[PDB]
Every structure is written in C-alpha cells, then in structure tokens.
Amino acid sequence: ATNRDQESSGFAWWAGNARLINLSGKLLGAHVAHAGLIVFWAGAMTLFELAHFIPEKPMYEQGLILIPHIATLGWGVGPGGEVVDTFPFFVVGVVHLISSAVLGFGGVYHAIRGPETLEEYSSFFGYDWKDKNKMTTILGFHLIVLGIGALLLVAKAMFFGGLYDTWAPGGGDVRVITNPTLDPRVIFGYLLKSPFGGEGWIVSVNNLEDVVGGHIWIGLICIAGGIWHILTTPFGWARRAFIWSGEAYLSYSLGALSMMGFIATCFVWFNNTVYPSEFYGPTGPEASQAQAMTFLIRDQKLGANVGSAQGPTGLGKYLMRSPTGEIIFGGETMRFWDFRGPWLEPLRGPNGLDLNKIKNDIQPWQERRAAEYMTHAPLGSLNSVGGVATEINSVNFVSPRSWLATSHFVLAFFFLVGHLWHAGRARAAAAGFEKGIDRESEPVLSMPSLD
Amino acid sequence: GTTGERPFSDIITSVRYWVIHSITIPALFIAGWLFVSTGLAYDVFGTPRPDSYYAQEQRSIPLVTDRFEAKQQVETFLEQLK
Amino acid sequence: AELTPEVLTVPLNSEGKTITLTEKQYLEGKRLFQYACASCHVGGITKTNPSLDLRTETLALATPPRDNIEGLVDYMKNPTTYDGEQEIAEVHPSLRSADIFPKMRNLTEKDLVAIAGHILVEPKILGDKWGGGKVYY
Amino acid sequence: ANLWERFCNWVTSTDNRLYVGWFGVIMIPTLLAATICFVIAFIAAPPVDIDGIREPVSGSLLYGNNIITGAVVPSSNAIGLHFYPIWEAASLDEWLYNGGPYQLIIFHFLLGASCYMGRQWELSYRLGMRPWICVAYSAPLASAFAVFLIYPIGQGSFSDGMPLGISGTFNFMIVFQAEHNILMHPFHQLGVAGVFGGALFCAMHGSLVTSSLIRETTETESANYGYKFGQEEETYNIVAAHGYFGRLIFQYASFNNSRSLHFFLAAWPVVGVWFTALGISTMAFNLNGFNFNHSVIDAKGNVINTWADIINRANLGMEVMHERNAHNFPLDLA
Amino acid sequence: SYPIFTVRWVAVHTLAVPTIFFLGAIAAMQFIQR
Amino acid sequence: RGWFDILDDWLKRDRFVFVGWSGILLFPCAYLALGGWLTGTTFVTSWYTHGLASSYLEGCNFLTVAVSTPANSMGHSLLLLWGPEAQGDFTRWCQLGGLWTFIALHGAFGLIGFMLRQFEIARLVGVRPYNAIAFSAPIAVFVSVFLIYPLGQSSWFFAPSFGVAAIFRFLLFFQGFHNWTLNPFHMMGVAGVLGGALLCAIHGATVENTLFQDGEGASTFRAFNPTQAEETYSMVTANRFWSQIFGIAFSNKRWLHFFMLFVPVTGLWMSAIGVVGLALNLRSYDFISQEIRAAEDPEFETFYTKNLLLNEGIRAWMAPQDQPHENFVFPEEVLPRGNAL
Ligand code: CLA
Ligand code: CLA
Ligand code: CLA
Ligand code: CLA
Ligand code: HEC
Ligand SMILES: CC1=C(/C=C/C(C)=C/C=C/C(C)=C/C=C/C=C(C)/C=C/C=C(C)/C=C/C2=C(C)CCCC2(C)C)C(C)(C)CCC1
Ligand SMILES: CC1=C(/C=C/C(C)=C/C=C/C(C)=C/C=C/C=C(C)/C=C/C=C(C)/C=C/C2=C(C)CCCC2(C)C)C(C)(C)CCC1
Ligand SMILES: [Cl-]
Ligand SMILES: [Cl-]
Ligand SMILES: [Fe+2]
C-alpha cells in the first residue's frame, strides 16, 4: 500500500493524515478539497441566511453573521443600515457555492487519481520541505496573493461603491473613501498603542479613512515581502534559529492563527466601526452606556436635575467623573466610559459629557437608539433566551457579537494547543527522540547527579 | 482468553441475528410508543396530564401534608379537578 | 385547568361589551407579542420604564382607558403618555411610526387585535406574575 | 569561549539543581515580584475600593482578616481595564486605595506561569524527552488565564476578576452563578466530569498498582522498600491487575497496555479542564448556561415549576444582594 | 460450539429490551401538545 | 461435595460477567436502583410532594428530570410499598415519593454488594484488596449525603433528589443555608479531589513523555508487551526532570501509586465528616470576631461579610418555593435587596 496503512507509514489511522507528509500530490488534493469546504460553507450559509432573512427585523435579531459582513462592504444597504436590495447577498452566496464545486473537483482529482508526489512531474510544483529556497518562494507567491487581496478591499472603498460608514453624518450611510490615511505616524501609531483600556491597540480604529489606509500599507508591504522572499534565501542567523521541517512550518502557522483568533475575538467584542452596531447589535460597553442614557432621559423628562443628583454612595446617580476628570455616566457603567459611538458623541464636549447638551440637545433618534441598544445587550443563554441568567423565556435572542467572540476564543485556544503540540514534536523529531528515549544511551545516565 | 461465549462481532453480523431482531427491536419500540400514546402511562404512575395539574381557578398546589392520611389527600385533590 | 372561552373573553370596548377569542388568536397574539413587544415588555413589565406595566389594573387607569381591545388597538396606532396628554409615536413603536420602527410595517389590524387579546388574557392566566417582575419569577 | 557563550551554557545547563533556561530568565524575576508583592499585601495592604464606589473592602491580616477571609482585593471599577502601574499613581497611598497590587501581582504571575509552561518544554528538549508535559499544564494555566484576564476583558473591568483570597474565591463563584448560570453550562459540567473522573481514575490506578505489588519485603518493613530507584524490572504484575479488573467489570473494559492506560490518565482530566476553562472564557462574553425558566406550562398556561425554576430562585437571591450599593439602574448588564 | 443462551445473554437483554421500550415511549412524548 | 460446594463452583465459574456470591446481593439491587431512576425520570411527577414537574412525560429534559425526595410530612418513613402510607397502591406509592426510598435503599445495598465483589474477586485472583479499600470513600460519601444528612434533619425531603439540576439546587441550598464553602472539611475534600485530578494528569503525562523507544513506529502504543519484564518508561529521567523543574520528584514507584490512592480517598472521607456535622446544623457559618467588629463598625467590610449577604438573599428568595410545606408568605417589602436590582 502506498502508505495508507500503519505498517508501511508508521502512523496509525487516528494520525492517518500524517502519512501525507512527503506525498506532495496527495497533500495538494487535501488542501484544495478542504479549501472547497470553506468556500462551500460561505456559499450555503449565505443562502441559508438569505432564505431566513426578514428585512423588517434588525439583522442581529435573526442570527446572521455572514450577511452583516456583506452589508459592511456597502452592498445591499442604504442610509441607516436599512436593507434596500437583497440581490447582492444572493450573488455572493451562489458564486462561492459554485466555486466550491471546481475546488472540490480539483481536490478529489489530486487526492485519488493524480500523482501521489509532484517532484517527478515538474520541478516547479514539487518541493522538499527542507529546500529553504523553494519554501521561501512559495511563501513569496502567497504573500503577493494576500497583498492583492488587501488592495481589493481598497478598490471597493475608493472606486467600486464605498463602504458602510456608521459614523457618516445623518445616522450612517454607504460612502466612498477618497482620502485614505497614508501618514505612517497614524497607520503605525496604532501598532504602538497599549492594548489596555482607553487605548485598545489596533481595536480602537474608529474611522474608515484609517481602515482603507492601513490596507494600502499592508497590501504594498505584502507585495514587497513576496518579492523579497522569491529572490532571497534565508540568512545564516535565520537558518540556525528555526527547525526546517513540514511539521515545524505547520506549528508556526498554528501559532499565527491562534494570535489572530484572539485579536478577532476582541475586534468583534469592542469595535463598532468595522462591526457596525446597526448589523451586529450593540457592544457590551455600548449597551451598558445606553441604559444609563435611557434612564437619564426618563428622569430628566420628569424634572430631575441629573447633574446634581447625588447617588446612594455619594457619587452622582447619573453623571460622575472618570479618574482623569472627564464627565461620564454613573453607576456600574463607569467602567465603560471609554466607549465611543455615533449616537452618543454629539453630547460630548471638551470635558466629557456636556450638561447643556444633555439638558437641551437630545434628539428622539438618540432616545430610540439608546432604548434599542439597552434591550439588545449581548447577554443570553446557550438555548438563545435573551437577557440575564435570571430572565424568563420569551425573547429568542443571542447577540452575534457573543456568537462570534465565543466561537473564535474557543478556536484560538485550541490552535495555541496545536502550536505547542506540533512545535514540541517538530523539535523532538528533528533531534530524533520523538519516539522515545534510547535505552542504550539514555542521556540522563551520562550526566552528573544533582546531589 | 475466551470464556467460551460466541464473539459479539460474530453475532451482530450474522444473518440469523438480524432476522430475529428486525422484529423484536421495532416491536418493543412500537410497544413503548403505545404505552404513552394510549394514555396508559398517566394512569399507571399517576402523572398529571396537562389539564389536571390545577383546578380551573386554583393557584395552590395539591401538596400532601399528612403521613398516614396521604393516599386519602391525593384522592380528594383528584376529585376536585372534575 | 385549560384554555376556555371563559378565560378567552375580554372587554372589547369601554362600554362593557366583550368579545371571545379563539385558541388560534391567543397563540397568534403571543407569537406577535414576542416578535414586536417582548424586548421591552417581557412578562408585562417595561424594561425601559419599570414604573409602567401591562397589568389590567394599570391599563384601566390610563387616560383613555386601555383595558379593552379597542383602547389597546388605538394605543398601538397612536400611543400616548399615561395621562393622555402627549403623543409618543416618536419613541414608542406604533403604526403611526412604522417608518422608524420597521417591525410595525407588516402588522395588519387583525394582528394588533391578537396582540391586545394576549395582553388582556395573560394576567387571567398568570395572575400576579404578569407585570410583577422578578419577585414572582 | 567568550563570555556570551559561557553565559548561554550556564543558562541552558542541565547540571543546575534547578533548571534556568531562557524561559527561566523571564519566569524568575516575574514570579519573584508577584510573590513578594502578594505576601506583603496579604499581611499589610490597606482597604481597597474594588467596586469603585468609595466603599473599601478590607483584605489584609493587619486590618482584621484571618487566613480564610483575607485577600488581595481586585482593582477599582473606576479603573476598568486601564493599566495602573505604580508610576501612574500620584502616591503609593492612592495606588493602594485603588487596588494597584492586584494588577501588579496578576500580570507578573500570568507572565511567569506562561514561562513555567515554556520552561517545561525546554528542559524536556535538553534531556531528550518527549515534549508534551507542557501541554497538560496548559489546562490549569488556561484556567488561571480565564479568571484573572479573559473574564475581566469580556466584562470590562479587572474589578470582576477573581480575588486573591479564599473567601474572595467563593464570592466570585456565587456572583458567577447568578449572572451566568454556570451550573447549567455543559462546559462546566464537563469540568466536573473532568475532576471527578480524574480523582476516580487516580484512585483506581493507585489502588490497582498497589493491589498487585510483587512480594519483595517481610511483614515488618514497608512494602515501598520493594522498589529500588532505577531498577530495570517492574514491581507490580499488570497481568494480575488486568485479571482482577477484567473480572470486576468485563475483560475488555480493562486496559492491558500500559502506554494506552497512562495516556488515558493524562487525557481525561486535561480535556475536561480545557472545557471548564473554555466555559469561563466564553461566559466572559455572556453566552450563558441553559435557561429553562418557565419552560413547562400547563394546558391553561400556568407555569409548572421544575428544578430549573428552583435554581433560578436561588440565582435571583444572589443577583439582588451582590454589590448592594453599586447599581443605579434596573439591569446589571456587566 | 457456542451456546445461544448464557448468563451473558440474560445480562444484555435485561438492559436492552427495556431500553428500546423506553426510547419508543420517549419518542412519542415529543408529539404531546399541551 | 455438598450442594453448597456445587453452588459455589457455578457462582465462581469464569464467564463474561462474573457472578460470585456477592452477585446475589449486587445484580438485583443495582439493576433496581438503575431501573427505578430510569422509570421515575421517564414517567413520574413530583407534583404532590414538591409542586414540580420532573419527568420526560411532563415535558422535562435530561437536565431537569428527577426522582424527587418525598414530602416533608412523611418524615423518615421507609415508604414501603406495603407500608401504611401507600398500603399496596403502586400509583400512590409513586405519587408519595416511594421511588426515592426504593432507589436510595436498593442503591445502598448495591454499593455493599459491589465492595464485596471487589473482595471476592481479589481473593480468587490472589491480589491484595486495595481497590476494595479505596471504594470505601464513595460509600462514605453516599451514606453521609443521602442517608445520614436527612436523618439529622426533619425528613427525607431535604436529602438530595436524584437529578442533574436537583443536585445543583442542593449545592446552592448548602451555600445559602449551611455556608458549606467556609467548612474546612469541605475544603479538605476539595483539595483531595482537585489534587487527585492533578496526580492523574501529571502521572499520565510523565509516563507518556519518558517512554523508551521500544518500536520504530510513530504510534508508541504498539511498543508495549504486557509480558515484558522491563519498565516501559524511564523513572530516572522522569525523576531528574521534576527535580529540576519543581524542586522535588518521586523516586519510589510504589510510594507514587500508594499516594494516588491516598489523596482522593482521604479527600472524600474528610468531606463526608463535614456533612455528618451538617446533619445536625453544626455548621462553620460564622467567624464570631468578625461579626462583633462588623456589628460595631459600619465601615468594616471583608469578603466574608459580603458572602453572608449573598447567603441571606438565597434563603429569602428561594425558601417559599423550595419548602412549600412551610407556607412561607414573604411580602415584597421584606425581601432583602440591594439598590436598583
Ligand atoms: C506570512 C508572513 C511572513 C513570514 C512567515 C515570513 C518569514 C520569514 N521572513 Mg519575511 N517578510 C514578510 C512576510 C513574512 N516573512 C514581509 C511582508 C516582508 C516585507 C516587510 C518581509 C521581510 C523580511 C526580511 C527583510 C527578512 C525576512 C526574513 C524572514 C525569515 C526569518 C523569520 C524571522 O526571523 O522572524 C522574526 C523573528 C525574529 C526573532 C526577528 C525579530 C522580530 C521581533 C522579535 C518582533 C518585533 C519586530 C517586528 C518585526 C516589527 C514590530 C511589530 C510591532 C509594531 C507590533 C522567515 C523565513 C529574514 C530572512 O531570512 O530573509 C531571507 C529577513 O532578513 N522577511
Ligand atoms: C476534510 C478532511 C480530510 C481530507 C481532505 C483528507 C484527505 C486525504 N486523506 Mg485523511 N483523514 C481525515 C480527513 C481528511 N483526509 C480524518 C478526519 C481522518 C480520521 C478518520 C483521516 C484519516 C486518514 C487515513 C488513515 C488516511 C488518510 C489518507 C488521505 C489521502 C488519501 C485518501 C484516500 O486514499 O482516499 C481513498 C478513499 C476513497 C477512494 C473513497 C472515496 C473518497 C472520495 C474522496 C469521496 C469524496 C466524495 C465527495 C462527495 C466528492 C464528490 C463530489 C465531486 C464533484 C468531486 C487524502 C489526501 C490516506 C493517506 O495518507 O494515503 C497516503 C490514509 O491512509 N486519511
Ligand atoms: C493551489 C491549487 C493548485 C495547485 C498548486 C495545482 C497544481 C497542479 N495541478 Mg491542479 N487543480 C486545481 C488546483 C491546483 N492545482 C483545481 C482547482 C483544479 C480543478 C479545476 C485542478 C485540476 C487539475 C487537473 C485535472 C490536473 C491538474 C494538474 C496539476 C499540475 C499542473 C497544472 C498546470 O500545468 O497548470 C499550469 C497553469 C495554468 C494552465 C494556468 C491556469 C490557472 C488559473 C486559470 C489561473 C487563475 C488564478 C486565479 C486568478 C487565482 C484566484 C482563484 C481563487 C483564489 C479565487 C500541478 C501539479 C495536472 C497534472 O498533474 O497532470 C497529471 C492535471 O492533469 N490539476
Ligand atoms: C438482593 C435482593 C434484594 C434486597 C436486599 C432488597 C432489599 C429491599 N427491597 Mg427489594 N426487590 C428485590 C430484591 C431485593 N430487595 C427484587 C428481586 C424485587 C423484584 C420483585 C424487589 C422489589 C421490591 C419492592 C417493590 C420493594 C422492595 C423493597 C425493599 C426494601 C425492604 C425489604 C424488606 O422489608 O424485606 C422484608 C423481607 C425480608 C427481610 C426477608 C426475610 C428473610 C426470611 C423470611 C427470614 C426468616 C428466615 C428463617 C427464620 C431462618 C432461615 C434459616 C435457613 C437455614 C432456612 C429493601 C431495601 C421495598 C422498598 O424499597 O421500600 C421503599 C419495596 O417497596 N423491593
Ligand atoms: C421599547 C422600545 C418598547 C417596545 C419595543 C414596546 N414598548 Fe410599550 N412601552 C414602552 C415604554 C418606555 C412605555 C411607557 C410610555 C410612557 O412614557 O408613558 C410603554 C408603554 C406601553 C403601554 C401603556 C401601558 C400603561 O400602563 O398604560 C402599552 C399598552 C404598551 N406600551 C404596549 C406595547 C406593545 C403592544 C408593544 C408591541 C407592539 C410595545 N409596547 C413595545 C416601551 C416599549
Ligand atoms: C479526499 C477525502 C476526503 C475529502 C473530500 C473533500 C473535502 C471533498 C470536497 C468536495 C467539495 C468541496 C464538493 C463541492 C461540491 C459542490 C456542489 C456539488 C455544488 C453545486 C451547486 C449547485 C448545483 C447549486 C444550485 C443552486 C443554484 C445555482 C441557485 C440556488 C439554488 C441552488 C442552491 C440549488 C474525505 C475526508 C471525505 C475522505 C478521505 C478522502
Ligand atoms: C490593515 C489595518 C491597519 C494596519 C495594520 C498594520 C500596518 C499591521 C502591521 C503588522 C505587523 C508589522 C506585524 C508584525 C508582527 C510581528 C510578529 C508577529 C513577530 C513575531 C516574532 C516571533 C515569532 C519570534 C520568535 C522567536 C524569538 C523571539 C527568538 C528566536 C526564536 C524565534 C524566532 C521563534 C490598521 C491597524 C492601521 C487599521 C485597520 C486596518
Ligand atoms: Cl458581592
Ligand atoms: Cl448601574
Ligand atoms: Fe502508573
């Protein structure tokens, strides 16, 4: 048997894909066919969502995570996030799903029918894991494809309809970006921001200009690096530093994807710019701030002076200062004062919330949004009962920010475990004790006693 | 080793097995289905049907409050549903 | 106990006339109540203003009276404050503000009546629980 | 050999009584800072306004605590997720009032414990061992990350991180049940199976190997003297142990491969603790346990309580009393 | 030369035949409307 | 060769499922405990004893079904089918909670039978009975929790009910009423259970990662022969690793495996003792010095005082529904509550 059994390949069935490590043709088929399943899911799930979609309910009351990604890109939506035309969602769905069939055709062909290994069919597509030059060149190719991809997002924003801008004046609208940010002081200042509260590292990006700009930088950086790695081979210090094997390379990618999954988790939980609350529901901080606003408005309508109302602890019942003096909402939501959102910023002055604006300039749409966001806070049960844990059945709701953050923390953590597993194993295999200690030269036995 | 019984792989793959169990398994299932569908499970165990938890205008539960008059209490509760 | 036409008979107007609902309408009104109202009115309280609940005793003391189908249907078209003095379609969903509350667009007169019937039938079933809040969970 | 190479050989030396290693270079200063700050604060730190409401909680021994009630109190809710190093405070007195030691301790600790994990991989590479011990440690480390870091991140405040104290831990657990129904979450139920089963199988394996010790000693001396450190042969009879245990249940529910047996011992509690850590980490984003409150109703519509509704009444008691001065508005949204 | 009826036979059937009977009862319960 | 000796040979016959003398106690009792739980979670209510639904028949799922304890008014009655409470009536027996005593009592004697089964098999194979000895801890837990605890209380009503969320209720009751987290006997129980899981995980992983190479495959499992005389992993390398990582290590294989018996076994025994104390309400609920200070000094607050306020909320908010035979009527205005919530 061409591997395909434990005797000849040295791997059991439960580690059977390890048999493909040195069969480049059969390995190609697995990768392409699996890529087919990814494109398939993106396809079928969009159609599923569209089939279940009711345009009169908010997207986030309907369990949708893919249609919000298409709407953010400016397709299918008008002012306020309102769905104008669902046809683009159908196109996105059908086109991915059809593509998965040519991917699936190619993967099943390469895995079953085609050559087991590629190295005798063409020195271009074949490779040895240990070939440092060939390995960096494939890396270089894929770097170039990634940077092109980043530039496609730019072309949509600047030349092909714009992006949905939750900050656009008048309640949000699709909008063409004509002045991307290119100042590297801003683009890279994000990378040097602290990840802690009030700074938020790159999760704090709050305007589409910076977003489009950053993707011009990344797209050109990837294209440069792709070329760099196609024309270069690794330097001495890099060769002594890494393990050069199929398994080590996998373990470096597992590390990378873990880090990225943690960042994604925090992006969807905190960022309301590239995850517009119009589509994903309010953020945790946002909902909690919206509750303080709601009851500020109600009590003020009754004749309360919200600025001078002393709460039970002595802090203001409605308004207090943050630790650096800014006027902020009171109560437990004091933890969330870093929140920024289109519905709240018009009440903000140089020293924080402005009592004059609070007393006079609160519009009904702000009261509407605050009530809506407060009653769509991202709390709810695994069986999709909305609210705190003590609420009764009635509301069938779990925020998509909850679904997206929890699922990706779980994915990010298991890939960190995978990184440790395959990184440790690649080190041991390359030194030659991954199968156990050699009885005839147990290293400990040649070392002095500790005591 | 072997304690002398017929191996399990041998039986579930044999034809005589599934000939006998193509009937017994679904028959037991259907028998179980009929135990509930006929309403017989309610009367064996004394479990309320969805209409016999409360009387029409009572919000108190028929809690048994006496050790030796207990079976007599439940009978009194059961006749105030009618 | 069970769902009887006696339980399902609620005031139609303020003039003591009544109307009897079916099972289908009651479950329809509950389905539609969850769809459009429960985010704020779960169990008969009001999350964004707990001072006002959906108890029949409360609806009776609203101006105009709201403890009958017609008064409840009218509130869902042109809602007012509790004393009747201000209209609040700008901040409370209604047919009059179906533009800014899009969930109200696909509601027909038949639907609003089913919703009101639910609101009026439910406290006869749950008693204190309806509009009582967590004390009675 | 130059100085740098000499230094590298000492750092990675396998002859040090305690292995240092490159992970050890980070681990040693960070664990020492955390340990020394924790000891001093547990004995001496003044009261801390954990909930940001000017209502300080006394945690230290000198301020009227004992071992069971003492804690290093989490930092003020007014701070939220902001970074609060000593140099950001106007004075040590302000840093203490607002809960500064808690941030100092947990950041150094999580860093050191991550390097502890790394240090376990490192020494195993220098000794020629297989590398996956550090993977098993990832389960307790992941759990520590969940209570001190991830759960504060989801909720927006290190003031809802787990206190560094015995009673402070129970407070965390109760408040958590009210707000997430963690008992009704299958990932916690999986953690319970993880540690119950872990303890079960720990006792099983201990009792079965001990049941089959080969007679090597008289009745006066300890049986432990039948094993000599590093002896080549085994000291128990796995065939006899299999023979007992195969008959106790049935023959195939029992292991006869030592390797398969020991991998089962590692895999069971580690996987379960992975899940319970993943449960704290996903409830950090308020995906809570099953809500069956009022899930059964009768033909009229009356609520027929189940045991789930009884759990909810207890949850409601924790909810309404916890942090009894910290809420101005009716929903406790984080 | 295997028997068909053994103590083993009795053991597996004491469990299995009520199990399937109970599964059919529970399946039927899914269709009870209040 | 009497008839006794002939019966002995058939019981101790080597078959797929060993029977033995102990089986006569074990198999009937375990099967009826098991069967009684399955019967009661599937078909039987708790409406008349508790005011609760508890079966799939009523609409409960796997997490909310239970065989619930009998009503408080039954006291500690054995609740025999032929007893004076049910008087032969099977349907009434089910409604009055007889399945709880049925399951509790048959399960008690099934546990006895299982331990004798360990002694019986141990003697016939010729190994020492340390596995029987370890099983004493589960027995101690079962007896203290299901039998001794309610016997010290007013009735079987307050023992655990057999169900997933019924046990969760028991947990929270023990927090709110007994302050059981503060009890050092439970703390020792926690340390033994968490420590047993630790020892299980660390021993398994140490063996798996100090194996000798005894085959050429990447699956190391096939390189173990149960008749081989040699250790399958290196104790000397395991020892050095832990010595340099953690400071100390095991050096004795027998002590290592005795320690793994000892730790969880002693933990469960210690927690059993505290429950016996709770049978009498002999709690470690308070620290008196803290209450004296707190009562006099309204600025003194610790995590201990904070937890008692939580306990007080549990008691008042759950008692009316949890003990319905008490007819607790707590008006809103007396329910303890913080601000706003
Ligand atoms: C998928 C992306 C990817 C990957 C996997 C690689 C992988 C590799 N690159 Mg390449 N590279 C890329 C994209 C990528 N590159 C792009 C887009 C560019 C263009 C900017 C380059 C430019 C580049 C150069 C110029 C060189 C490499 C080299 C290397 C090799 C050494 C790796 C190394 O030391 O890591 C990094 C590990 C280290 C220990 C180095 C220190 C890194 C510190 C600790 C991290 C912090 C600094 C960080 C780079 C920037 C700060 C980020 C902060 C603001 C958050 C390795 C094969 C080297 C090589 O061998 O060339 C042939 C080399 O000299 N790469
Ligand atoms: C999506 C995940 C995935 C993918 C892409 C692969 C891919 C592959 N596996 Mg792995 N594997 C996986 C999951 C996966 N596996 C899992 C989960 C397990 C554990 C159970 C294994 C266990 C395993 C073992 C033990 C072995 C492989 C082997 C192989 C390779 C040859 C398979 C072979 O001989 O097929 C032969 C099978 C058939 C001819 C039956 C039909 C197969 C086709 C593909 C059915 C597809 C139908 C589908 C509907 C497509 C039709 C649509 C059309 C338009 C194309 C191949 C590259 C083998 C290998 O390495 O060989 C060197 C091998 O020995 N795998
Ligand atoms: C990354 C994926 C990948 C890779 C590296 C390969 C590589 C290879 N395949 Mg495979 N194949 C793939 C995908 C892939 N294929 C897919 C998807 C299909 C189904 C359509 C096939 C079907 C297939 C068959 C049936 C055969 C091969 C053969 C070959 C070999 C020669 C191909 C050649 O000369 O083309 C040279 C290149 C061209 C002719 C240019 C066309 C490539 C497209 C049109 C460029 C478009 C790129 C696109 C813009 C990028 C975006 C796509 C997506 C991300 C949206 C080589 C080993 C042959 C072989 O091994 O002989 C026995 C063979 O007979 N392949
Ligand atoms: C190992 C077998 C076993 C054991 C230990 C038990 C034990 C028990 N059962 Mg269970 N039971 C069993 C099998 C068993 N059962 C079987 C197989 C069934 C199916 C029919 C049942 C069905 C069942 C029901 C339906 C009920 C019980 C109940 C009980 C309890 C009361 C028992 C009682 O008072 O007996 C009294 C009888 C004896 C003590 C037997 C006396 C022995 C003889 C007569 C003594 C005289 C000997 C003589 C003087 C000298 C002989 C010497 C020799 C040389 C001849 C107890 C927990 C009750 C219960 O759980 O209540 C809640 C109950 O209602 N059982
Ligand atoms: C949050 C945006 C709400 C939604 C969704 C619904 N209601 Fe509402 N309701 C809400 C508030 C804040 C108030 C108080 C208004 C005021 O200032 O007076 C109300 C009030 C009512 C009433 C009056 C009850 C009374 O005691 O007089 C009724 C009858 C009512 N609301 C009905 C209702 C219906 C039928 C809804 C679904 C279509 C609905 N509400 C949704 C807040 C919110
Ligand atoms: C190798 C292998 C494997 C794997 C495989 C794979 C992974 C595959 C894939 C494959 C694929 C990936 C496939 C795909 C396909 C696709 C399709 C077939 C599609 C179709 C489509 C259509 C037909 C559509 C239609 C439509 C339209 C157009 C419109 C709307 C409606 C509808 C939707 C109907 C396994 C593991 C099994 C085993 C071993 C071996
Ligand atoms: C798009 C966008 C943007 C931008 C971005 C950017 C511009 C980025 C960058 C990025 C970057 C720039 C990154 C970097 C990274 C790095 C890393 C990740 C590193 C790593 C390292 C490592 C891994 C190493 C390791 C080691 C050591 C340390 C020693 C020796 C050994 C080894 C080598 C292993 C923004 C935000 C503005 C906005 C939004 C959008
Ligand atoms: Cl608290
Ligand atoms: Cl608040
Ligand atoms: Fe062992």
Author numbering:
A (entry chain c): 23 to 473
B (entry chain e): 3 to 84
C (entry chain v): 1 to 137
D (entry chain a): 11 to 344
E (entry chain f): 12 to 45
F (entry chain d): 12 to 352
The authors write:
Our data reveal a complex sequence of events, which occur over micro- to milliseconds, comprising changes at the Mn4CaO5 cluster, its ligands and water pathways as well as controlled proton release through the hydrogen-bonding network of the Cl1 channel.
Specifically, a slight elongation of the O5 density toward W2 and a slight elongation of the W4 density toward W3 are observed at 250 μs. This latter trend continues, and at 500 μs, an overlap of the W3 and W4 densities is seen, with an mFobs − DFcalc peak (Fobs and Fcalc are the experimental and model structure factors respectively, while m and D are weighting factors) at 2.5σ between W3 and W4. At the same time point, the W1 density becomes extended toward D1-D61 and W19, indicating a higher mobility of W1. Along with these changes, the electron densities at W1 and D61 become more prominent at 500 μs, potentially related to a proton release from the OEC to the proton gate residues D1-E65 and D2-E312 (Fig. 5(ii)).
